[PDB]
Enzyme design. Structure first.
Site, mmCIF file in Angstrom:
data_model
loop_
_atom_site.group_PDB
_atom_site.id
_atom_site.type_symbol
_atom_site.label_atom_id
_atom_site.label_comp_id
_atom_site.label_asym_id
_atom_site.label_seq_id
_atom_site.Cartn_x
_atom_site.Cartn_y
_atom_site.Cartn_z
ATOM 1 N N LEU A 1 26.728 -33.487 35.322
ATOM 2 C CA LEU A 1 27.166 -34.807 35.752
ATOM 3 C C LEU A 1 26.882 -35.848 34.672
ATOM 4 O O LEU A 1 26.094 -35.628 33.750
ATOM 5 C CB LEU A 1 26.474 -35.200 37.061
ATOM 6 C CG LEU A 1 26.646 -34.212 38.216
ATOM 7 C CD1 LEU A 1 25.977 -34.728 39.477
ATOM 8 C CD2 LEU A 1 28.119 -33.929 38.463
ATOM 9 N N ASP A 2 27.546 -36.994 34.802
ATOM 10 C CA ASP A 2 27.374 -38.103 33.878
ATOM 11 C C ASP A 2 26.194 -38.975 34.300
ATOM 12 O O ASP A 2 25.640 -38.834 35.395
ATOM 13 C CB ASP A 2 28.646 -38.949 33.804
ATOM 14 C CG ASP A 2 29.887 -38.118 33.550
ATOM 15 O OD1 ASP A 2 29.761 -36.885 33.413
ATOM 16 O OD2 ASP A 2 30.989 -38.702 33.489
#
Ligand SMILES: CCCCCCCCCCCCCC(=O)SCCNC(=O)CCNC(=O)[C@@H](O)C(C)(C)COP(=O)(O)O
Ligand code: SF4
Lengths: 112, 98, 173, 309, 173, 52, 106, 156, 83, 52
Positions: free
Chosen positions: I39-40
């Site tokens: 994920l970012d």
């Protein structure tokens, strides 16, 4: 050079995350306040899109000023200083999509 | 008793029933209390007039004055309660128990 | 029009049911204004002009107007009519039905007795045949308050003044 | 025939209000070195008709009334009470002669206040309620002083019968006896009708017809209050054989008083709520109480107690 | 087609929009008592099309070089049961769902006999005609644009305060 | 010590009255109004917005 | 019956005008303003209520002062005068209390 | 026909009422508002024609856009316009309101109020003289006089 | 019914499941958001805010950066509630 | 500001109303709504110069 607020990029990223949290939490209220037809996801998608637009910046000074401008837009949105159209201006709707394919641009006009 | 007296007494009974059976707003209870005062005014007025109790024609006026005083009191209490809680709901008055 | 007073009394009961159903304050206040106006009509029919205008000028004119004032400034309610949610609608209908049962048992049966004895004869009978001459019995008796009822005047005035004091002390926070 | 009398009391008053609009426009204009409506009809005589027709054809917008029921009752109450207040007035002979006509008038004005509260509350508009409550506050203070002044002046009338005022002022106008009360009474009447300087500029949600009727009721109340002032203080000679003389004189007096209402409207800046209430509570009320004491003591100390009958 | 051989005929199906006579018509059943529905509208499935989608298709058809002479049929994104559709309409419009002459009106008739028949007539399904996707316009679901047409028809507190979110109505697809 | 001498299951959770007869301020919602001086208002001359 | 007739006629006339002003003028077709009452969400200041309760009490005292015109016909003029002056003095005293203390804030 | 005659006469009556008692709202934005005041000033006196300045836009019939409609003010103008009841007419006073005038190429000036709201009468000038604005209103009155709303409804 | 470490974990994993971006197959107690779930940073911020909503407290940005694994979030909530 | 050409390089305009309206809040402190209208008038605020 005197830093605007953040001396390092890590400090600037901290400010960016703080702004993102505020925008993320404000989106549901904003839809209620201005009776927008966008969904809460749509607004939060736009917020992320706007943040990701300025994701190539590397100067902490520039990031600081971007956060300051982001704060100002949030302040107007929260204080209902903006109007319904102003909030919707982020979501370009009437503007016809301009194609990216060279052949399409070739047909469309003399666009360079 | 004439049917009019019966109707006025029944009105007093109905207003009393409404007052005792609260619903939500304390304002509604105060309205029922004042209604009862109105019914008592009408009853006493009719009785005094029919009996020709000339010296007692001032009784309804005194009743009316004192009625509205006790109302001024009720309203003042209601606004104090509403300002504290936010509404005039009878349920808000729950700190004191038993 | 011989039973006008009875009709007014029935409407008085109906309005009392209306505001006693504890509806939305705004609708209730009206249920009381209507009943108050009817009661004034009844008092006028019996000849109490001054007392009839008393309730119209003070009770309906001031007492219920200050009541409405409060409901307007402290407005935290969802508006509903007497024939709204069953809590109020059923109460209003049941009160009307009880009143109508009393009326039927009162007219069809002359000697109706629930808790007191009532006679179905028109109220016009109770009126007394007499002449006051150049007099207003109600007005004269009420004006006698300043002459005969000095004690009543003193007590009522002290109560009013102490009422002002009490109101301020209560609504000082 | 009695119904004919009721109609001959209602319809002319409404027409008079309609033309009073034009009269006000022209009077204010000419006090501003302007010509009032002069194009629509000769001397603007057709202006009120044009206004009425335009109003009853304008698209009525809905104000999201929390209670149409109530929003509709408020105009009805205002207009009906305004029409009813004219009934007891003696133009030499009153339509309905009440022994307590004055108290009837006061009660009718008191009920009229509800129209304001009902309009604002049902309007579902914060600004509407605020303004309505301000109107409640203004009319609240006038009623006290108005009642006190009316009682004090009627202490020489001998009763609350309106017709008796003509007999009491047969020789001398009441104003010459109670001119300070007259001043406070006129200002209180201005306050009652919210006529400037007791306006609160800036029930607006009413659209066209509704608004038009509220406007008519307010102006009819203006005319009626000026008539009440005329009967109370500016007594008129009445010949029992020829009442038309009294009718003419009374009408002229009422017209003069309405013209003074407009004249004040375009002469003075508007008050402030605090100033208006610091007048009707801290200047008028004490003076009214003192003058009531004086008008109670005076008839006794001068052996001038008026006849009861 | 006979006069204009290359005419591009379009056949929309119950266009809906802010100033539409289909969604607003159902949300105006208050004038017509409860919700007058032939057989409770249980045998009628309608396919409504968004106003902008139809308009954009028309513009696209003008530009389209092959659209000439082709009879297009503008269909909606989903087919809704008439009863479910009306239930959804009243739902987002904060209107009590009460499932239940106007031609005479010289001014614009509130209801037409043909309109009543057409309302209770289930929309046809022609799979042999080009649709919006042929012109490139992607059909927009009624759900997304429902509030824009019917929020303005809210009664008291649903465009704010409670603001309960009505889930999409079942589609007969 | 406690609300009642013999408490029940429901009353067990119930808190004894505060030491001072002062119940804590609840919510403390601000009543300060935020009015906007709409431009159409005469004083605003049509081109003035005063958030007040 | 006359006063009742006047009340009936006035009320019916007003209601008829309200009919011809609320339902008759809206018959004319004026398109449709698809404009929602955009609402997205309390000044219960004592400054208003105080004006109301004080008015109620002063109105009550005024009610006691109404029978004065007929009370002037009493033989016991001294007693009636004293009582009337007493009621007026009490009204003035109530006003003074509010003025001297924290009142008349309106 | 008789039906046409009745409808036409009634339409003329309705037209007369509106044109005689036009109620304008002063949307004074810029320099042109000053000349608008001079129109209501004693010399010209728009009220003499029945045109009384109605502060309330909810009770107005004519919106006189007097001044430079900036981008910031543009949403307000339209929102006020749609809150006006009908029939509603828009009169554009001044070159700035007409097509931007001196500020046509400005970055924050709407290129004419015609874009935001439909305009009925355009009053030229910078500022248009009070007589010219009065002339425009009279032209609007004649424009209303020519309207045949009822006739078209009958002939529909 | 005092909060348990297992209950804290259950609510944390429930919030992660509600997060559509997280793949349920790759979801784990220790699965790193930026590595295991990939994920970012903004996604991590969103997850932290969702955790704050679930457990009704507030996490400062520093601690939010510290929380890089669901188990780490569980432990932080354990300290927050002193469980 | 002149650069030697026939067109000004920079022309800042000092509007007296601009500063006066900036101090409106300071003057309006401890006043009522109607007083704000008076304070606007006493500053003689024309938004043409204020907004330049
Ligand atoms: C209705 C929707 C309204 C949306 C309004 C959203 C806004 O306020 S747009 C302004 C946002 N601009 C910024 O946050 C500037 C961020 N500048 C950067 O350089 C960042 O990308 C950083 C510092 C590299 C961080 O990047 P990551 O989040 O790690 O990748
Ligand atoms: S047209 Fe001329 S006078 Fe009118 S606003 Fe524009 S610049 Fe000012």
């Amino acid at each position: 050079v005197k830093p605007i607020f953040s001396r390092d990029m890590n400090e600037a990223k901290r400010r960016v995350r703080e702004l993102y949290r505020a925008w993320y939490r404000e989106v549901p209220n904003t839809v209620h306040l201005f009776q927008l037809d966008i969904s809460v996801k749509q607004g939060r998608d736009k917020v992320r899109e706007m943040f990701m637009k300025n994701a190539h910046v590397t100067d902490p000074r520039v990031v600081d000023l971007l956060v300051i401008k982001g704060k100002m837009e949030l302040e107007e949105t929260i204080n209902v200083w903006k109007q319904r159209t102003h909030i919707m201006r982020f979501f370009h709707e009437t503007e016809a999509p301009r194609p990216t394919d060279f052949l399409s641009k070739f047909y469309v006009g003399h666009d360079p | 008793m004439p049917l009019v007296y019966m109707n006025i007494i029944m009105a007093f009974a109905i207003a009393l029933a409404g007052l005792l059976m609260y619903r939500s707003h304390l304002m509604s209870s105060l309205l029922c209390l004042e209604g009862m005062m109105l019914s008592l005014f009408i009853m006493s007025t009719l009785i005094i007039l029919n009996t020709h109790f000339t010296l007692a024609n001032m009784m309804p006026i005194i009743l009316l004055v004192f009625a509205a005083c006790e109302a001024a009191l009720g309203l003042s209490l209601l606004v104090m309660v509403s300002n504290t809680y936010g509404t005039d709901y009878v349920q808000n008055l729950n700190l004191l128990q038993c | 029009t011989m039973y006008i007073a009875f009709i007014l009394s029935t409407i008085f009961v109906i309005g009392f049911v209306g505001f006693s159903s504890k509806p939305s304050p705004i609708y209730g206040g009206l249920g009381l204004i209507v009943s108050g106006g009817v009661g004034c009509g009844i008092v006028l029919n019996f000849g109490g002009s001054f007392l009839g205008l008393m309730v119209f000028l003070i009770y309906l004119g001031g007492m219920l107007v200050v009541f409405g004032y409060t409901t307007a400034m402290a407005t935290e309610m969802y508006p509903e009519v007497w024939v709204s949610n069953k809590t109020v609608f059923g109460a209003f209908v049941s009160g009307l039905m009880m009143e109508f049962c009393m009326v039927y048992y009162a007219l069809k049966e002359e000697e109706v007795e629930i808790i007191f004895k009532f006679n179905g004869l028109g109220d016009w009978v109770i009126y007394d045949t007499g002449d006051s001459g150049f007099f207003s019995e109600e007005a004269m008796g009420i004006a006698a308050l300043y002459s005969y009822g000095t004690w009543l005047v003193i007590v009522t005035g002290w109560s009013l003044l102490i009422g002002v004091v009490v109101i301020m002390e209560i609504t000082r926070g | 025939m009695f119904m004919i009398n009721i109609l001959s009391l209602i319809i002319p008053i409404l027409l008079a209000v309609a033309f009073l609009t034009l009269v006000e426009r022209k009077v204010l204009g000419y006090m501003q070195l302007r010509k009032g409506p002069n194009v629509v009809g000769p001397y603007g005589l057709l202006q009120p008709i044009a206004d009425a027709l335009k109003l009853f054809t304008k698209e009525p917008l809905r104000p999201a009334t929390s209670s149409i029921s109530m929003f509709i009752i408020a105009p009805i109450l205002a207009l009906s009470l305004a029409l009813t207040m004219w009934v007891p007035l003696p133009m030499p002979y009153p339509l309905i002669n009440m022994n307590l006509g004055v108290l009837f008038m006061l009660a009718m004005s008191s009920l009229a206040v509800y129209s304001i509260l009902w309009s604002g509350w049902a309007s579902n508009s914060k600004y509407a309620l605020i303004g309505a409550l301000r109107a409640v506050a203004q009319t609240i203070s006038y009623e006290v002083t108005l009642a006190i002044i009316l009682l004090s002046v009627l202490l020489m009338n001998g009763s609350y019968t309106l017709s008796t005022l003509i007999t009491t002022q047969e020789h001398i106008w009441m104003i010459f006896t109670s001119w300070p009360l007259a001043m406070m009474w006129f200002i209180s009447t201005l306050a009652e009708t919210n006529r400037a300087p007791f306006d609160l500029t800036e029930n607006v949600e009413y659209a066209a017809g509704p608004f038009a009727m509220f406007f008519m009721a307010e102006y009819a109340n203006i005319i009626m209050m000026n008539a009440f002032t005329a009967i109370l203080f500016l007594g008129a000679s009445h010949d029992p054989h020829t009442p038309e003389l009294y009718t003419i004189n009374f009408v002229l007096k009422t017209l003069a008083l309405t013209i003074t209402f407009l004249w004040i409207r375009a002469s003075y800046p508007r008050f402030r709520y605090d100033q208006l209430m610091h007048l009707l509570w801290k200047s008028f009320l004490p003076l009214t109480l003192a003058l009531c004491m004086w008008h109670i003591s005076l008839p006794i100390m001068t052996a001038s107690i008026p006849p009861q009958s | 087609r006979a006069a204009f051989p290359e005419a591009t005929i379009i056949k929309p199906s119950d266009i809906f929009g802010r100033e539409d006579r289909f969604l607003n018509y159902f949300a105006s059943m208050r004038w017509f008592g409860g919700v007058p529905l032939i057989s409770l509208g249980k045998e009628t499935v309608k396919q409504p099309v968004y106003i902008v989608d139809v308009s954009k298709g028309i513009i696209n058809a003008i530009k389209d070089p092959d659209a000439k002479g082709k009879t297009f049929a503008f269909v909606g994104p989903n087919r809704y049961l008439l009863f479910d559709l009306v239930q959804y309409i009243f739902a987002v419009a904060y209107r009590p769902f009460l499932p239940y002459l106007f031609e005479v009106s010289p001014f614009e008739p509130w209801t037409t006999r043909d309109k009543v028949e057409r309302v209770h007539m289930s929309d046809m399904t022609l799979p042999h005609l080009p649709g919006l996707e042929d012109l490139g316009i992607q059909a927009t679901p009624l759900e997304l644009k429902a509030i824009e047409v019917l929020r303005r028809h809210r009664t008291y507190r649903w465009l704010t305060s409670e603001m309960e979110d009505v889930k999409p109505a079942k589609t007969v697809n | 010590g406690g609300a009642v001498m013999y408490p029940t299951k429901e009353t067990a959770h119930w808190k004894p009255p505060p030491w001072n007869d002062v119940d804590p301020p609840k919510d403390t919602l601000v009543s300060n109004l935020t009015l906007n001086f709409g431009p159409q208002h005469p004083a605003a001359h049509g081109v003035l917005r005063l958030v007040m | 019956m006359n006063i009742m007739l006047t009340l009936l006629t006035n009320v019916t006339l007003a209601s008829l005008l309200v009919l011809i002003a609320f339902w008759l003028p809206q018959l004319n077709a004026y398109s449709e303003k698809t404009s929602p009452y955009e609402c997205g969400f309390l000044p219960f200041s004592m400054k208003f209520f105080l004006v109301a309760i004080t008015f109620l009490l002063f109105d009550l005292e005024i009610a006691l002062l109404l029978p004065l015109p007929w009370a002037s016909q009493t033989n016991n003029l001294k007693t009636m005068l004293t009582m009337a002056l007493f009621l007026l003095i009490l009204l003035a005293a109530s006003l003074a209390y509010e003025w001297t203390q924290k009142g008349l804030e309106w | 026909s008789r039906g046409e005659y009745v409808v036409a006469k009634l339409d003329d009556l309705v037209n007369w009422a509106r044109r005689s008692s036009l109620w304008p709202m002063t949307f004074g934005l810029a320099c042109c508002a000053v000349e608008m005041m001079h129109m209501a000033a004693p010399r010209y006196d728009m009220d003499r024609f029945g045109v009384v300045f109605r502060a309330s836009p909810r009770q107005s019939d004519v919106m006189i856009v007097a001044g430079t409609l900036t981008n910031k003010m543009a949403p307000a103008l339209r929102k006020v316009y749609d809150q006006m009841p009908e029939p509603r007419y828009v009169v554009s006073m001044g070159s700035c309101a007409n097509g931007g005038g001196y500020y046509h190429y400005s970055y924050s000036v709407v290129r004419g109020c015609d874009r935001i709201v439909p305009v009925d009468i355009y009053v030229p000038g910078c500022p248009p003289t009070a007589e010219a604005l009065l002339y425009g209103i009279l032209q609007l009155q004649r424009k209303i006089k020519r309207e045949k709303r009822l006739r078209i409804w009958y002939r529909r | 019914p005092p909060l348990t470490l297992e209950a804290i974990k259950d609510r944390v994993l429930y919030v992660l499941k509600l997060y559509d971006k997280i793949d349920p197959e790759k979801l784990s107690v220790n699965s790193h958001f930026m590595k295991d779930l990939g994920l970012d940073s903004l996604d991590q911020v969103e997850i932290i805010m969702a955790m704050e909503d679930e457990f009704g407290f507030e996490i400062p940005d520093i601690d939010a950066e510290k929380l890089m694994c669901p188990q780490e979030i569980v432990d932080y909530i354990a300290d927050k509630k002193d469980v | 500001v002149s650069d030697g050409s026939s067109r000004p390089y920079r022309c800042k305009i000092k509007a007296p109303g601009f500063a006066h309206l900036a101090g409106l809040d300071k003057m309006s402190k401890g006043h009522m709504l109607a007083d704000v209208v008076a304070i606007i008038g006493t500053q003689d605020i024309v938004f043409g110069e204020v907004d330049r």
